[PDB]
Amino acid sequence: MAGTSAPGSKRRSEPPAPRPGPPPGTGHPPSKRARGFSAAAAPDPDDPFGAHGDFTADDLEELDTLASQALSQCPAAARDVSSDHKVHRLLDGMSKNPSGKNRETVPIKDNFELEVLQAQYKELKEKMKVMEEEVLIKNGEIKILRDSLHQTESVLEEQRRSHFLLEQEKTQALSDKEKEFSKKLQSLQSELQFKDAEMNELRTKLQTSERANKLAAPSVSHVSPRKNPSVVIKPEACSPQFGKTSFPTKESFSANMSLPHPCQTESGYKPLVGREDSKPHSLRGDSIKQEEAQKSFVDSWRQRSNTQGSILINLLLKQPLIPGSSLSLCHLLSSSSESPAGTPLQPPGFGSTLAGMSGLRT
Amino acid sequence: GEHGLELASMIPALRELGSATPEEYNTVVQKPRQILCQFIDRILTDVNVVAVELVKKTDSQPTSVMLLDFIQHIMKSSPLMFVNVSGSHEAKGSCIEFSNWIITRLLRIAATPSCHLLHKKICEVICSLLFLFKSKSPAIFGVLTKELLQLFEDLVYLHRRNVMGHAVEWPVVMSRFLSQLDEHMGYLQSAPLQLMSMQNLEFIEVTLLMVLTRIIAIVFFRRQELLLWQIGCVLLEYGSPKIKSLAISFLTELFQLGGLPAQPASTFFSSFLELLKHLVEMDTDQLKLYEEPLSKLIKTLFPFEAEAYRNIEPVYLNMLLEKLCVMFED
Amino acid sequence: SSHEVIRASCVSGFFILLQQQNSCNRVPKILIDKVKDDSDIVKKEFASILGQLVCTLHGMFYLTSSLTEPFSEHGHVDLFCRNLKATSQHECSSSQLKASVCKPFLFLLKKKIPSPVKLAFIDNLHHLCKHLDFREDETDVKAVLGTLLNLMEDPDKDVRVAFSGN
Numbered sequence: 001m002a003g004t005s006a007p008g009s010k011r012r013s014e015p016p017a018p019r020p021g022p023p024p025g026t027g028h029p030p031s032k033r034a035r036g037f038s039a040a041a042a043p044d045p046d047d048p049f050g051a052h053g054d055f056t057a058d059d060l061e062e063l064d065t066l067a068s069q070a071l072s073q074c075p076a077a078a079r080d081v082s083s084d085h086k087v088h089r090l091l092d093g094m095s096k097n098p099s100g101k102n103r104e105t106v107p108i109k110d111n112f113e114l115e116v117l118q119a120q121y122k123e124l125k126e127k128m129k130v131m132e133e134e135v136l137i138k139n140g141e142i143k144i145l146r147d148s149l150h151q152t153e154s155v156l157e158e159q160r161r162s163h164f165l166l167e168q169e170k171t172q173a174l175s176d177k178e179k180e181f182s183k184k185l186q187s188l189q190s191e192l193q194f195k196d197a198e199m200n201e202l203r204t205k206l207q208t209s210e211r212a213n214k215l216a217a218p219s220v221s222h223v224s225p226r227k228n229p230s231v232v233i234k235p236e237a238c239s240p241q242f243g244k245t246s247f248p249t250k251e252s253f254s255a256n257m258s259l260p261h262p263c264q265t266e267s268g269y270k271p272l273v274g275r276e277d278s279k280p281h282s283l284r285g286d287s288i289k290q291e292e293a294q295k296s297f298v299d300s301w302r303q304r305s306n307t308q309g310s311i312l313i314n315l316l317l318k319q320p321l322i323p324g325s326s327l328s329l330c331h332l333l334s335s336s337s338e339s340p341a342g343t344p345l346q347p348p349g350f351g352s353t354l355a356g357m358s359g360l361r362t
Numbered sequence: 363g364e365h366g367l368e369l370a371s372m373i374p375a376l377r378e379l380g381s382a383t384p385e386e387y388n389t390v391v392q393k394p395r396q397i398l399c400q401f402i403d404r405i406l407t408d409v410n411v412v413a414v415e416l417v418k419k420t421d422s423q424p425t426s427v428m429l430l431d432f433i434q435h436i437m438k439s440s441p442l443m444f445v446n447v448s449g450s451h452e453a454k455g456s457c458i459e460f461s462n463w464i465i466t467r468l469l470r471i472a473a474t475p476s477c478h479l480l481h482k483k484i485c486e487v488i489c490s491l492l493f494l495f496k497s498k499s500p501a502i503f504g505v506l507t508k509e510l511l512q513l514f515e516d517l518v519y520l521h522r523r524n525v526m527g528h529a530v531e532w533p534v535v536m537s538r539f540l541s542q543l544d545e546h547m548g549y550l551q552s553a554p555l556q557l558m559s560m561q562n563l564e565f566i567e568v569t570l571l572m573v574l575t576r577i578i579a580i581v582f583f584r585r586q587e588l589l590l591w592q593i594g595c596v597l598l599e600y601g602s603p604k605i606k607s608l609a610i611s612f613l614t615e616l617f618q619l620g621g622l623p624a625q626p627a628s629t630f631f632s633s634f635l636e637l638l639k640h641l642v643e644m645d646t647d648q649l650k651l652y653e654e655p656l657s658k659l660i661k662t663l664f665p666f667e668a669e670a671y672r673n674i675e676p677v678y679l680n681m682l683l684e685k686l687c688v689m690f691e692d
Numbered sequence: 693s694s695h696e697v698i699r700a701s702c703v704s705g706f707f708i709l710l711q712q713q714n715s716c717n718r719v720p721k722i723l724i725d726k727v728k729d730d731s732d733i734v735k736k737e738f739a740s741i742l743g744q745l746v747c748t749l750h751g752m753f754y755l756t757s758s759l760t761e762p763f764s765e766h767g768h769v770d771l772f773c774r775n776l777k778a779t780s781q782h783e784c785s786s787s788q789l790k791a792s793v794c795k796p797f798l799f800l801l802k803k804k805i806p807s808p809v810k811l812a813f814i815d816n817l818h819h820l821c822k823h824l825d826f827r828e829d830e831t832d833v834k835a836v837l838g839t840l841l842n843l844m845e846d847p848d849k850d851v852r853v854a855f856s857g858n
Contacts, residue, residue: 013644020598024605063644069598075554120553159553162514202512244508251509255458260412284761288723297589311506318455328817331760338719338757350505352453 012064019069028077033086036074039067040090047097054107055094058114068117081124088126091118092133099137104146112149119156127160128168131175140179144186151193154200161203173208177201177217183224188235191228195242195249198224202249206256213253215265221246222271225278240282240302246275247308251315272316273325277332279309284339292346306343311353313340317360337361364405368418371398372425379428384436392439399446408454419460422450426464434489437496444500458506465515468497472522478529488534491526495537498523502544511549520545520552524559535570536579543586550590557599560587561606564631567624568610574620581623581630588630593641601645604638607631608652611659618666618673625673632656632676639683653687656680693733700740707747712754719758726765735776738769739784745818746788749811763818779831785815786835790845797844801851809852825856 003010022032039057046055053059057067074083098111119127134153142150157172166172180201183194198221204212225246228239235242250272257263283306286299294300313336316322323330340361347354371394378391406418429443451457471494482488501507501516511517520542527538542556567580610617617628635656643649660677663670703725706718722744728737741762748759770777789812798804816824832849839845 010646016598017645017648020602023598024602065597068596072554072596072598075558158512158514162518166514199512202509205513248509248512251506252512254506254509255456255462258456259459290720308509314455328760328820331756331814331818334757334759335761335764338754338761341754341757350452350503352449356453356455 009061009063012061016064016066016069019066019073023069023073023076025073026076028079029074029083030079032070032074032076033083035070036083036087036090039070040087040093043090043094043097046094047100050100054101055097055111058094058110059107062110065114065117067114068121071117071121075121081122084122084124085126087118088123088129091115091123091126091130092137095130095133096137099139102139104143109145109149112152116149116152116155119152120159123160127156128171131157131160131168131171135175142182144190147182147186147190148193151190151196151200154197158200158203169205170207172204173211176204176208177212181220183220184227184231188228188232188238191224191232191235192238192242194224195228195245198242198249199245202245202252206259206262209253209256210262210264213264215263215267215271218250218271219267221249222274225271225275229278229281237298237301240298240305243275243279243282244301244305244308247305247312250275250312251308254315257319269316269320269324272312272320273327273329276309276313276316276336277329279306279312280332280336280339283309283343284335287339287342287346290342290346303343306339307347307349307353310340310343310347310349310357313360314353314356318356322360333361365418365421368406368421372421372428375425376428379432382432382436384439388432388436389439392442395439395443395446399449402446402450403453407451408456415457415460419451419457422447423460423463426467430490430493433493434486437492440493441496441499444496445503448500448503458510461504461506462510462513462515465510465519468494468501468516468519469522472519472525475522475525475529479525482529488531492533492537495534495541498537498541502541507545508548516545517552521555521559524556524562527559527563532570532573532576536576539576539579539583543583543590546586546590550592551595554596554599557596557603561603564603565606565610568613568616571616571619577620578623581627584627584630588627588634588637591634591637593637600638600641601648604635605652607635608655608659611655611662614659614662615666618663618670625670629673629676632673632680636676636679636683639686650687653684657684693736696728696733696737696740700744703744710751712751715751716754719754723758723762723765726762726769729769734769735781738766738777739781741766741769742781742785742815743788746785746791746815749814760818763820766818782828782831783835783838786812786832786838789815790835790839793839793845793848796848801848805848805852806855808848809855813856829853829857 022035025031042056046053071087074087094111095115098108098115101108101111115130119130123130125132138153140150157169157175160166161169161172180197183197185191185194201209201213201217201221225243228235228242253263282302286302286306289299291299294303323333325333340357344354344358375391375394375398378388378394382388406422409415409418426447429440429447433440451460471491475491501519504510504516507516516523523538523542523545526534527542530538563580563583567577570576614625614628617625639649657680660680663673663677667674703718703721706714706721710718722741725737726741728734731737745759745762745766748755748762789808793808796805796808800807813824816828821827832853836845836849836853839849841849
């Protein structure tokens with residue numbers, strides 16, 4: 001024996017290098033859309049067996065990302081949107097074949113991320129008809145790593161919400177939180193996928209955000225904000241990113257309630273209470289670190305997230321009644337005001353959210 | 363009265379906009395705009411419902427339209443007035459729809475920069491694009507943008523900034539250099555749009571053989587971009603631009619002909635080359651075949667070695683990569 | 693004790709030389725004095741912390757801002773709770789409760805002595821017990837014993853004892 005199948009992994013990357021030399025061809029990729037059609041030749045042929053086979057490109061290897069790499073080669077240049085439609089027949093066929101690979105025995109996990117790479121690369125309606133295909137074909141009874149690919153389905157819809165009026169966000173407003181009640185759940189990356197599902201909750205706007213959220217999800221997210229530090233671990237940058245995504249996601253109702261204030265909110269102050277203390281669980285802990293120069297950026301990230309939390313500190317107090325607390329979070333609010341007056345002096349930053357938080361924490 | 367003084371003092375500012383040859387008079391009107399910055403700190407903020415939300419904010423947008431009108435060449439008061447414009451509705455804890463309108467005001471120029479691919483003229487409208495470059499500092503100063511890009515904001519217009527990097531003159535490229543790097547400083551890993559624009563920036567920087575102020579600003583952007591060089595991106599887009607840098611490694615005499623910051627950015631690119639080496643590889647000889655051209659580029663810097671030593675230190679960092687790749691296993 | 697009591701009195705001198713400046717500066721030193729745990733006098737340094745945490749209620753602008761943080765630093769010092777972390781500090785903490793109880797003769801026994809039934813309970817809420825009235829009762833019965841109970845400490849205890857229980 002000269003070498004094992006790692007030489008084939010050295011060949012599949014070299015086949016991805018053949019895909020990369022194909023990606024090193026040129027600009028606009030009608031020929032690679034035809035190769036996506038040549039992929040669609042294979043992609044129609046997979047479920048044509050419908051018996052004990054798989055999508056052979058995904059069944060070739062695991063790390064070989066030619067489904068993304070040819071789509072990366074298909075991201076050559078926009079000519080025009082049928083390249084963003086030609087692999088749609090390659091998309092839903094192997095997706096129904098992955099749906100024909102239901103219960104995910106040993107090869108159906110990696111399909112949805114290839115579909116997500118297909119979702120992220122180019123779909124004019126090649127995602128929207130795929131969303132019209134997935135409306136007829138979707139099963140969400142997921143598991144540990146399958147929670148991530150379900151958020152990869154959530155990664156598609158906001159990416160599909162891009163074009164001119166988002167063109168299917170009202171159709172995505174049908175695809176609502178009716179299956180999204182599976183939090184208090186799997187691990188930190190899945191919690192980052194839940195933060196990605198919260199990034200999907202930082203999406204699906206006033207067509208459905210005034211319906212789906214109702215401030216009982218953010219309290220369930222306030223339980224998740226408790227869970228992200230407690231139900232797992234090793235989320236040092238991950239829960240920091242999950243807070244930083246929640247810093248976007250809690251601020252995703254900024255112009256929403258400041259348009260006509262519908263917002264469906266029942267418990268409008270519970271989630272803002274424990275999370276702002278959970279900010280001080282990291283940011284006053286970073287104000288316990290209290291460094292001036294950033295480490296490289298992980299100090300600069302959470303501090304900008306604290307500068308984002310500075311807006312969040314200005315957020316709830318500007319509308320809702322602050323200091324109407326019962327627990328020792330008001331005693332932590334003074335510690336948050338200790339984190340404030342530290343970081344307010346340490347800001348050298350935007351004076352609007354500085355002086356407002358100087359009247360919010362005080 | 364408050365609407366009427368806005369129909370008087372901004373009309374007095376329209377009388378100040380009736381003469382733009384300033385000489386500390388429109389700057390005194392900018393001092394009056396600083397007084398209006400105090401007045402926007404005083405009143406006309408957090409006001410009544412949708413009519414009043416459309417009453418003075420559109421009049422402030424009409425003030426922003428006259429601020430959009432007085433572009434050439436008074437960028438000093440304009441960037442100053444953009445700061446109070448950022449300070450206008452931000453403390454109101456509202457009017458982010460007006461900022462989403464200001465996003466659509468920015469997104470209006472995205473079609474115009476797309477139209478610049480078809481037809482473009484008018485250096486004053488390029489000064490209005492330079493007024494929009496002042497809005498790029500204001501988009502950098504938007505600061506709810508990562509909260510706004512969850513609703514598909516200027517993350518989209520980062521491609522319009524990459525389209526501003528497509529139509530990128532030495533004013534417009536440095537305009538494209540900062541705010542994109544600032545948006546890179548905001549977050550990373552957009553959906554593969556600017557990796558295409560990366561080699562459209564990086565290789566075309568070797569094409570740009572003059573305009574050192576654009577080159578220094580690009581190295582200032584490369585100071586963020588080599589900082590943006592990281593192992594959490596598209597798993598194949600990196601190596602091709604790395605090979606495109608290895609393609610650019612055959613021609614780094616212009617990188618030395620550009621005096622210092624480009625060669626420092628090339629050293630930062632060499633630092634990014636070792637940072638690409640600091641990531642996983644998944645291409646065994648292809649890294650080394652790129653490294654042999656890089657060792658030739660190391661020999662090329664060893665060929666013209668009269669000034670540079672940080673490049674030699676980057677070559678020593680490449681030697682630190684080479685010592686790592688010398689005999690590590692056996 | 694030749695150093696820390698010379699530094700806690702210096703911290704008291706930092707508290708003496710305080711409008712809020714050293715009271716902001718020694719707040720960092722008091723929160724990092726909790727890092728100097730794991731010693732024989734660390735329970736005395738926790739007593740030096742908790743009396744300063746009792747004195748963190750005194751300035752009550754930047755020190756009460758540090759108080760629950762110091763109680764979290766006491767919780768950071770609480771790797772595992774102990775009886776000396778429960779009991780021997782408590783009468784010493786009640787000695788700080790017996791400090792201001794000397795000058796507690798204001799005409800707010802329904803308010804300030806109930807605030808003394810609250811601010812002591814806030815330190816017990818900083819101790820964060822569920823039976824914080826009844827779990828502190830035998831220590832307070834030992835502490836009201838340590839109180840002279842001549843004229844002012846007695847009814848301030850017994851009505852607060854009538855507040856906390858029957």
